[PDB]
Ligand binder design. Structure first.
Ligand SMILES: C[C@H]1COc2c(N3CCN(C)CC3)c(F)cc3c(=O)c(C(=O)O)cn1c23
Ligand SMILES: C[C@H]1COc2c(N3CCN(C)CC3)c(F)cc3c(=O)c(C(=O)O)cn1c23
Ligand SMILES: [Mg+2]
Ligand SMILES: [Mg+2]
Lengths: 194, 471, 485, 198
DNA sequence: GTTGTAT
DNA sequence: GATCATACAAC
DNA sequence: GATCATACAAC
DNA sequence: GTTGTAT
């Protein structure tokens, strides 16, 4: 456990210093942040709101990437570093949970956060530190989220595991890629409307 | 270059403009009504939820739905200004007795704001319903809204001493009001005690009402201030935190986080030793943990340097009879009691007039059902409903209404079991009209009905005392 | 740690999450419906406004109120997103035919943002009322709202081709639509034409529907793309600001702009010109003054002596947004799926949705007319046999027995019997029958007519055409955008 | 006649829908509250001699504000920047960009407050302007008003009714501000209680 | 600085 | 959505 | 209230 | 960069 008095504007940090039990919850907006922050067990569970839609790095200029304030917050939280400074052995959290809303928009933010993690935090995903919350989010009380998704004794997590990197690399490039035509085809192909 | 220009002295405009914003901010924004102890916003949110049908029994509605209405109808201001007020009426730390039941993020004790009106839905609180009881029985005066295309109440029935129970605050113009919360039960006790022995005194009133009872609990050191406060309407009191070093309860309007941040600052500036650690192990089911330091010395310093111990200055200012007045405990009780009497009477008169009206039309129907053969013969012979009414009135000596009531009679109500069904109702009304007539005639009953209907509230909504008074 | 943990494949979840958001946006946000040419939020605002009762006849209602019920009953998104979408369809420059009437600062062409909701009030536009006509006669299917405690319409009646007339745009996922506004009267003439002559060709149609008719006006350069868009749904068009050269009072040229292209901000172009004039990227400009008044556009670019206005003009047309291209991408939702439709296909779509709405109404009107006359037949018999009727009633203890007798004595249905039991004594006057008779007689005619319309498809189309001519006759404009080669 | 010609740097506030003319003897500067009204004014203002300068929120009370706070306020800053007059030891009334400063606040009580905060600023840090008879006050018959509505009623000099802010006794003026705006509350409390008809 | 209705 | 200044009284 | 970055396609 | 629905 920490001792405080030490020294992101947001990100409600926990009270322990054991990146083996501690957890970071990346929720979207301070609407879901308060609910999550007001019943998280501030001992091994910290929250960090991702304001707005995360930048799609699979189509962004590595200059605009190093510019985004949101991606700097998430990296600043983790404490891993970036690119040549990637130090998985220094991650402040052994569990990064993606707790986006249960709407489509949240589903979108899921893909963005995943592309960001897979591209510029692969070592994290390769080590299995990335999970995905499984809600049944601002329209939810404190005890409601705690007794449903945030409590370890209960709840249900989804460990992100990559199988065929090639397939993974291909997918992102297809969906989050620059080429649009390929993406459309995918829509036309794997999509049932009526 | 203007055509019709006029001259306006500076001092003249300044005095005019200022008074205009002063009065408006005082008697219509920042100061509560001594009666229902509400300020225009809260009163509009309540009457809003009411008309919207977000009653405690009905399901919740999205705040955007509520704010949208309260704004487009009564309160001509910003969503934030409203939704923000609505959010305080739903926080246990803010109101001693909440006036709203919302779902979703409605803020935290740590200063955390509420969520977006697109995520949170809410509805009246059960106890809040008492603020509106019999609102639709002419118990309150109504007025046109800013748009002049809607009507709103100047005050709510307030079947419980809201002002004293929940408190008031605060900042106006050239004056500010600060009233602390009290226990629902204790207050009611005071109300009754006054209705019993008007010759009561400050000391006596304090027998059933120790003092404030903040929704956070904590402790109030000293009692001398409470007295002078209840006697003059102005006074000061100290509020300390419940500790055992762990802190269990913080003072009124005090933030745990802020205290935490400030405690950290005092730790890194030769302002206190011992400070080994300062954590906040507060859960969703309770509240803040903090050698050779004695602690009692460092603990005594924290309360005298930080915010763990604060002073609450009584300044009971409300709006009585259109003017802001510094009222005392008695002045507030008498003011509430008088408002209560007006409502029971007003309501009683309302039922009275309805029953009597109902009986009048009931007497006719009977007369008609008795002579259905002639009544129908009269109608059948009648060419126009206008003539049909004149005849019935001339034959059976009936009034325009009674006659109209007869003409609007469904055939299915011309059966046998019907007559006796109207008689049974009619008979019951005479007893009602006769009972209500006695209540309006006997000031004693109205008073008793008040006492009774209060104890019913104290029995359904009263809490245990949270704030422990010390000396 | 946890207890019950599952394992998700990155590629697996990715494709799932994306496919969800992908379709979500396509069929439920970005692209509109080919029939009413509306998108969820626009349709929810219109219907919502209909329920709030803010019709052309009734007075305006605070904006916050409108968005308040629309967000609380239909559109499960941010307040801003609704109010924004509402304001837009109230701007003469954003909507070729506005669907909303506002009161107060609803923004300006110069990019000005409308005032806060706490200031502006709005209501339906007289024409928007056509988008809802017979909404309550079961001409449109409804469905549960997001909360499953409110019922909303999948599509609207739309008694005028709102897709072509007001256009669309447009950004979704994997796709994006772009349709230009047209002239009301013209669009209608096109719809009517395709109805009377199915063998019509794009050329034949373009004879009455020349092309785009944007709200601001301006000029179109090259019709080649216009025919390409109508025949394939994809095409390129060149748009140019209507201009004119004037001679200042001193005797030098003065370039005057009166009608910028569609979706072109005057001020944005004013700032663009200054950045180019102060950058030596364009010389010859004496000054750039905006003399636009609350009664017209006047953007003046005065040229210096010894300088060809024309030379500067073309330079502006080539460098500023004073001349731009319009990417015809006529993509709309049809049969649940997004499709790139031609002009004919979009018309055929409207005519059909038009036939359906009419029939349903006719049916709805019939079923009601008949249901009534049935009750009228009962009331008559009852008013003919009032004595015996009243006898049966009074001699009955329970209504169940009273009704049962009336039905059995006069051979009446449960509906008819109840009707007789609910008759007011006032209905038992002399003049009352002759009234109920007239009504009944009138119903037999209506039911006859309505029975015919549903028997003759020739009458349904004729009813449509006739009703279009009326919409046209009442809301049609004069063409604003001049097409030229 | 003399007028602007774009291309100019100006370096004026981001807001401020400055006019076209450059004659500080015809042009007008309208100090509106919020862009809700500013937008109505900005569009439909005869953009030739009428400039719109939106003031956001409640202007700082100079009577209770430290000079160090006055020099930090961007709201008052933009104003002095719009006039081009100067501050304190530089205030040149002979260098003002406008000879007509029209205060146009909302027709609500809150509007009457901003109106109060302004005049104190104009009388405490722009006295020369008021002593020159430039400060005027719109007399409407604002966010809930259309373009043609604003102009036809208060912005058009051919039908608008304006009022010239004139000062009688500077002694009585210094006192009224010291009471109504001064850090003193008791006096202000007594004033309200004495000159207020509920 | 902080409290709460306001621009 | 989050965040920015400010009036107004009173510790 | 005003503003701040972002997804998404096409140009 | 700009367009228009969304976070
Ligand atoms: C959902 C929130 C997300 O954050 C937003 C923005 N940011 C993204 C993150 N940046 C760090 C700071 C700025 C933004 F610039 C604009 C809006 C906005 O207009 C908006 C709305 O509902 O109308 C809602 N939101 C916005
Ligand atoms: C009326 C406007 C005036 O401007 C405002 C602020 N500013 C003052 C001027 N500053 C230069 C920039 C910040 C502010 F910080 C907050 C609010 C605010 O919360 C708010 C509301 O209706 O809830 C309304 N307004 C605010
Ligand atoms: Mg605010
Ligand atoms: Mg936005």
């Amino acid at each position: 456990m920490k001792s405080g008095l030490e020294i992101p504007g947001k990100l409600a940090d926990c009270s322990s210093n054991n990146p083996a039990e501690t957890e970071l919850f990346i929720v979207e907006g301070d609407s879901a942040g308060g609910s999550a922050k007001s019943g998280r067990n501030r001992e091994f569970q910290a929250i960090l709101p991702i304001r707005g839609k995360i930048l799609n790095v699979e189509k962004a200029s590595m200059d605009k990437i190093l510019a985004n304030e949101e991606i700097r917050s998430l990296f600043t939280a983790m404490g891993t570093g970036f690119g040549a400074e990637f130090d998985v052995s220094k991650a402040r959290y052994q569990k990064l949970v993606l707790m986006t809303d249960a709407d489509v928009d949240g589903a979108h933010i899921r893909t963005l956060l995943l592309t960001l993690i897979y591209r510029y935090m692969k070592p994290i995903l390769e080590a299995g530190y990335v999970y995905i919350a499984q809600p049944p989010l601002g329209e939810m009380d404190d005890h409601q989220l705690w007794e449903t998704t945030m409590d370890p004794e209960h709840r249900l997590m989804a460990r992100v595991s990559v199988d065929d990197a090639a397939e993974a690399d291909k997918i992102f490039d297809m969906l989050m890629g620059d080429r649009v035509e390929p993406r459309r085809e995918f829509i036309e192909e794997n999509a049932v409307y009526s | 270059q203007d055509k019709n220009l006029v001259n306006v002295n500076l001092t003249k405009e300044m005095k005019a403009s200022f008074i205009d914003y002063a009065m408006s901010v005082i008697v219509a924004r920042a100061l509560p009504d001594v009666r229902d102890g509400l300020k225009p916003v809260h009163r509009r949110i309540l009457y809003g939820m009411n008309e919207l049908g977000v009653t405690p029994d009905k399901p919740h509605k999205k705040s955007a739905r509520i704010t949208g209405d309260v704004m487009g109808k009564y309160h001509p201001h910003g969503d934030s200004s409203i939704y923000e007020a609505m959010v305080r009426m739903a926080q246990w730390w803010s109101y001693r007795y909440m006036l709203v039941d919302g779902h979703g993020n409605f803020g935290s004790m740590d200063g955390d704001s509420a969520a977006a009106q697109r995520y949170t839905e809410a509805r009246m609180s059960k106890i809040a319903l008492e603020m509106l009881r019999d609102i639709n029985k002419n118990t309150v005066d109504f007025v046109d809204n800013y748009d002049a295309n809607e009507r709103e109440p100047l005050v709510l029935p307030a079947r419980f001493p809201n002002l004293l129970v929940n408190g008031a605050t605060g900042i106006a113009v050239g004056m500010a009001t600060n009233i602390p919360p009290h226990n629902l039960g204790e207050t009611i006790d005071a109300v009754k005690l006054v209705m019993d022995n008007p010759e009561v005194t400050t000391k006596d009133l304090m027998e059933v009402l120790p003092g404030p009872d903040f929704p956070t609990g904590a402790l109030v050191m000293g009692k001398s201030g409470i007295h002078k406060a209840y006697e003059t309407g102005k006074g000061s009191i100290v509020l300390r935190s419940r500790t055992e070093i762990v802190v269990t309860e913080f003072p009124y309007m005090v933030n745990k986080t802020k205290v935490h941040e400030h405690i950290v600052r005092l730790v890194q500036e030769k302002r206190i030793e011992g400070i080994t650690a300062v954590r906040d192990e507060s859960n969703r089911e309770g509240v803040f943990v903090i050698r050779d330091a004695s602690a009692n010395v460092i603990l005594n310093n924290l309360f005298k340097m930080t915010q763990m111990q604060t002073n609450f200055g009584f300044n009971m200012l409300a709006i009585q009879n259109g003017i802001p007045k510094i009222l005392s405990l008695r002045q507030i009780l008498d003011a509430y009691i008088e408002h209560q009497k007006e409502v029971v009477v007003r309501r009683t008169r309302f039922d009275k007039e309805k029953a009597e009206a109902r009986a009048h039309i009931l007497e006719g129907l009977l007369i008609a059902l008795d002579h259905i053969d002639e009544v129908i013969r009269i109608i059948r012979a009648s060419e126009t409903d206008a003539e049909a009414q004149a005849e019935l009135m001339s034959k059976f000596k009936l009034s325009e209404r009674q006659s109209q009531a007869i003409l609007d009679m469904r055939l299915r109500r011309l059966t046998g079991l019907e007559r006796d069904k109207i008689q049974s109702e009619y008979d019951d009304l005479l007893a009602l009209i006769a009972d209500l007539a006695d209540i309006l005639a006997k000031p004693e009953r109205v008073s008793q009905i008040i006492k009774d209907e209060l104890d019913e509230v104290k029995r359904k909504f009263s809490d245990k005392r949270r704030t422990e008074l010390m000396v």
